[PDB]
């Protein structure tokens, strides 16, 4: 599907509620591993496992390292603005 | 972590309870996207989102296409035997 914008509003003393994997190579891109249901990301509802993170707070992450992505997200203000894109998957 | 063996026992009229992403390139490797809690994969308990699928029922999937992996899993007997390896992730 098409790339889309996600604005995560931080909550004090809570993590955003995502885990990320990947980065600059079995998984070059940066992707969402998990989303905690009872969390900012869960409450948002539009960020999903398997979503590729293409930008965070204006910074291009399309050829980024795991560290650059982690850093971009941690140093983002509020809201944390992602551009994400879903990847094709198969249910078995 | 180390590669490990997972034996999924199929249940009649139920899907295995996994979704997979990736394949032969933002995600070259084959990885578990989702595991349904109330399913064979969920009941097993040892297969997790973010796990790289390296073999299925004896077939090497280390340079496999999405289609080859889907096919390997669908054509597997019972139990469906995976070799998987976790990838590093970061919680935010």
From Swiss-Prot, chains A, B:
Interacts with CLDN5, DLG4, GRIN1, F11R/JAM, CLDN1, NG2, CRB1, MPP4 and PALS1. Interacts with HTR2A, HTR2B, HTR2C, PLEKHA1/TAPP1, PLEKHA2/TAPP2, CXADR, SYNGAP1, CAMK2A and CAMK2B. Interacts with FAT4 (via cytoplasmic domain). Interacts with DLL1. (Microbial infection) Interacts with human adenovirus type 9 E4-ORF1 protein. The modification Omega-N-methylarginine is found at residue 24. This is Multiple PDZ domain protein. It is found in: Cell membrane; Apical cell membrane; Postsynaptic density; Cell projection, Dendrite. It comes from Homo sapiens. The PDZ domain 1 binds NG2. The PDZ domains 7 and 10 bind the Ad9 E4-ORF1 oncoprotein. The PDZ domain 9 binds F11R. The PDZ domain 10 binds the C-terminus of CLDN1 and KIT and the C-terminal PDZ-binding motif of HTR2C. The PDZ domain 13 binds CXADR. The PDZ domain 2 binds CAMK2A and CAMK2B. The PDZ domains 10 and 13 bind PLEKHA1 and PLEKHA2. The PDZ domain 13 binds SYNGAP1. Expressed in heart, brain, placenta, liver, skeletal muscle, kidney and pancreas. It is linked to Hydrocephalus, congenital, 2, with or without brain or eye anomalies: A form of congenital hydrocephalus, a disease characterized by onset in utero of enlarged ventricles due to accumulation of ventricular cerebrospinal fluid. HYC2 affected individuals have variable neurologic impairment. Some individuals have other brain abnormalities, including lissencephaly, thinning of the corpus callosum, and neuronal heterotopia. Most patients have delayed motor development and some have delayed intellectual development and/or seizures. Member of the NMDAR signaling complex that may play a role in control of AMPAR potentiation and synaptic plasticity in excitatory synapses. Promotes clustering of HT2RC at the cell surface. Residues 5-88 form the PDZ domain. The chain holds residues 1148 to 1243 of 2070 of the full protein. Disulfide bonds: none annotated.
């Amino acid at each position: 599907m098409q790339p889309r914008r996600v604005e995560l509003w931080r909550e004090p003393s809570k993590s955003l509620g995502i885990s990320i994997v990947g980065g600059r190579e079995v998984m070059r891109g940066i992707f969402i591993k998990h989303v905690l249901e009872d969390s900012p990301a869960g409450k948002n509802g539009t960020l999903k496992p398997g979503d590729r993170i293409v930008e965070v707070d204006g910074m291009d992450l399309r050829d980024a390292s795991h560290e650059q992505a982690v850093e971009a997200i941690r140093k983002a203000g509020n809201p944390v603005v992602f551009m994400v894109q879903s990847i094709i998957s198969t249910r078995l």
